[PDB]
């Protein structure tokens, strides 16, 4: 249905026997030309190993105000500014990911050490009682 | 990664929640009997 490279809804679907993963022909051409393998799993892929799919010709309806000024002055701004803000917020999400990963490695260090000490103290008092 | 680490840290502080009860009763018995 959708594509795993641009996150796009294709009018040009092509999936490969090297990675059965619905990918957008544009980014699939670009990738397999960059390095001749799949991007997602990276089983070696040549661009002619894939096979296209025959699409149901999916269409979105031309809105009532569709013309030169609507598709030029207004429309491109929403798309470009929303790509800008979306990609920026996504990199921000990666920053938050690095922060939470560091905090989590800290918490794991704490758990491991405190457990190593208490597992001893317990059976230490237990051995003294078993004396 | 944060999911696995969070489950780990929570259920891991649980290990101490049990160990502390055991050792605290243990030293108390050690004094008692």
């Amino acid at each position: 249905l959708i594509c795993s490279i641009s996150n796009e809804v294709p009018e040009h679907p092509c999936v490969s026997p090297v990675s059965n993963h619905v990918y957008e022909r544009r980014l699939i051409e670009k990738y397999i030309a960059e390095n001749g393998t799949d991007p997602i799993n990276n089983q070696p892929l040549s661009e002619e190993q894939l096979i296209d799919i025959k699409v149901a010709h999916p269409i979105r309806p031309k809105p009532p105000s569709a013309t030169s000024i609507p598709a030029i002055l207004k429309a491109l701004q929403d798309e470009w500014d929303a790509v800008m803000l979306h990609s920026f917020t996504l990199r921000q999400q990666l920053q938050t990911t690095r922060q939470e990963l560091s905090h989590a490695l800290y918490q794991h260090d704490a758990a491991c050490r405190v457990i190593a000490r208490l597992t001893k103290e317990v059976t230490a008092a237990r051995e003294a009682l078993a004396t | 990664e944060l999911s696995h680490a969070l489950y780990q840290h929570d259920a891991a502080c649980r290990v101490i929640a049990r160990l502390t009860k055991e050792v605290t009763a243990a030293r108390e018995a050690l004094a008692t009997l």
Binding site: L1, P58, I59, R60, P61, K62, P64, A66, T67, S68, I69, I72, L73, K74, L76, Q77, W80, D81, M84, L85, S87, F88, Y106, Q107, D109, A110, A111, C112, R113, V114, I115, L129, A130 | Q8, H9, A11, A12, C13, R14, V15, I16, A17, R18, T20, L33
Partner: protein, 155 residues
């Protein structure tokens, strides 16, 4: 690492406090910098405000032919009306339902995993509390063995 969740129904403050003590002891094209400028800068590129206003005689004749193309796209929109609208509606629902079928799959898998974990914990903790009970009994009766040694020994 050793952590059975399902068993203990029950602390957080003390375990996490000692934890925090241990923790205190512890790629695209030039578009990359273009979008860096355009996004940090924030401003929107000066748009296509040329065909609208009205050279200006060209833009007025352009408004003519363009609203002609607008009545053409209006022909090509009213040719359907509600028809190709419902054409997209029904297909939209028939594409919608599948993701929720998948969520049903995920619910079933995770909940049956938990259904295994329950009885697993119940067998494990049962045998382990039996071990604790055996320990209590042997420790008590072994201090009793020491008392018996003391008595039979003093004689």
């Amino acid at each position: 690492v050793d952590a059975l969740p399902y068993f203990d129904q029950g602390v957080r403050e003390a375990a996490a406090a000692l934890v925090e003590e241990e923790t205190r002891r512890y790629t695209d094209i030039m578009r990359n910098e273009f979008e860096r400028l355009a996004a940090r800068q924030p401003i929107e590129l000066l748009s296509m405000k040329r065909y609208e206003l009205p050279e200006c005689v060209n833009n007025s004749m352009a408004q003519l032919e363009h609203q002609a193309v607008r009545i053409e796209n209006l022909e090509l929109m009213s040719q359907h009306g509600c028809n190709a609208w419902k054409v997209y509606n029904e297909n939209l629902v028939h594409m919608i339902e599948h993701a929720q079928k998948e969520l049903q799959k995920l619910r079933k898998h995770i909940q049956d995993l938990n259904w295994q974990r329950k009885n697993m914990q119940l067998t494990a903790g049962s045998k382990l509390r039996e071990m604790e009970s055996n320990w209590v009994s042997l420790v008590s009766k072994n201090y009793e063995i020491e008392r018996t040694i003391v008595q039979l020994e003093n004689e």
